[PDB]
């Protein structure tokens, strides 16, 4: 059951510039592109752990709670309230639009690449401390004719 991405096998000089991934990627025509993808768009900090959640919006329905929405979308409900400036996490409303996903960077430090560029490592804030977390970029990062892409 192969990873969907697999960028690393056709790239080199893989590096970071903030939350941005940069690589020299192999093209269809045999040449190279230098390409960048913002990992802050696709990676979230789920209370101390990298999670593949793309930046997005969800609309609250009758009967939803923040725990429910956090459950449904692999997000930490305390982050959803903080990110959406919800002072009372027990009070949300049908039709409320909430920003979810991405954003790992603003709760991360010691961000770096290990294992030849295949893995992203970082200390991620959780409620109570900092947790060293690692994620296989190849899971969802692909090279598409010289362009780093999410898939
Ligand atoms: C963090 C978390 O998820 N906590 C959960 C609580 O949210 C939840 O309490 C119930 O919350 C919902 C959602 O905010 C309440 O409904 C809102 O009520 C207002 C006022 O009546 C209404 O205007 C909104 O339309 C309505 N929102 C929605 C989305 O329908 C509801 O009244 C709360 N119910 C009670 C009994 O407190 C509790 C219970 O599910 O779980 C917590 O984990």
List gaps in the chain by the residue before each (C–N > 2.5 Å): none
CATH architecture classification, 1-54+101-151: Roll (2.30)
Output helix, strand, coil percentages for the chain, rounded to the nearest 5: 20, 45, 35
Q: How far is CA 143 from CA 51, 102, 110, in A?
A: 21, 20, 26
Q: Which of 68, 92, 97 has most ligand 1 atoms within 8 Å of CB, for mutation?
A: 92
Q: Where in the chain is the domain with CATH 2.30.60.10?
A: 1-54+101-151
Classify domain 55-100 by CATH number: 3.10.350.10
- Judge whether 122 and 133 are in contact, CB under 8 Å: yes
Ligand 1 neighbours, Cβ below 6 Å, are: 60, 62-67, 77, 89-94
Residues 6+ apart with CB under 8 A from 86: 66, 80, 92
Residue 97 near residue 109 (C-beta atoms within 8 A):
no
- The residues of the chain that CATH labels 3.10.350.10 are 55-100
- State the DSSP code for 137: G
DSSP 3-state assignment of 19? coil
Q: Give the pair of three-digit tokens for residue 151.
A: 């898939």
Calculate the CA 129 to chain-centre distance: 20
Smallest CA separation from ligand 1 atom 43, residue? 67
The span from the CA of 114 to the CA of 104, in Å, is 18
> Which residue of 91, 94, 127 sits with most ligand 1 atoms within 8 Å of its CB, as the best mutation to test the pocket?
91
Handedness of CA 50, 131, 122, 9 (dihedral sign): negative
How far is it, in rounded angstroms, from Cα 69 to Cα 56? 13
Q: Residues 55-94, buried b or exposed e (16+ Cβ, 10 A)?
A: eeebebeeebebeebbeebebbbbbbbebbebeeeeebee
* Beta carbons within 10 angstroms of residue 10's beta carbon: 16
Atom in ligand 1 nearest the alpha carbon of residue 94: 29
Other CB atoms within 10 Å distance of the CB of residue 137 = 27
C-alpha–C-alpha distance, residues 139 and 5, integer Å: 5
CA distance 16 to 120: 10
d(CA 140, CA 60): 28
Q: At how many Å resolution was this determined?
A: 2.2
CB half-sphere exposure, 32, CA atoms < 13 A: 10
**Cα–Cα dist 120/118, whole Å:** 7
């Amino acid at each position: 059951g192969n990873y969907a991405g697999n960028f690393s096998g056709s790239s080199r000089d893989i590096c970071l510039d903030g939350a941005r991934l940069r690589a020299e990627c192999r093209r269809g025509d045999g040449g190279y592109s230098t390409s960048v993808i913002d990992l802050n768009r696709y990676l979230s900090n789920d209370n101390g752990h990298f999670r593949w959640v793309s930046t997005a919006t969800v609309t609250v329905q009758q009967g939803d709670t923040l725990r429910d929405i956090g459950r449904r979308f692999d997000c930490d409900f305390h982050e959803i309230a903080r990110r959406n400036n919800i002072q009372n996490e027990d009070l949300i409303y049908p039709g409320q639009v909430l920003q979810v996903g991405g954003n790992f960077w603003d709760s991360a430090r010691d961000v770096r690449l290990v294992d030849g560029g295949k893995v992203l490592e970082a200390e991620l804030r959780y409620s109570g401390g900092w947790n060293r977390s690692r994620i296989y970029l190849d899971e969802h990062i692909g090279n598409r004719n010289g362009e780093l892409i999410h898939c």
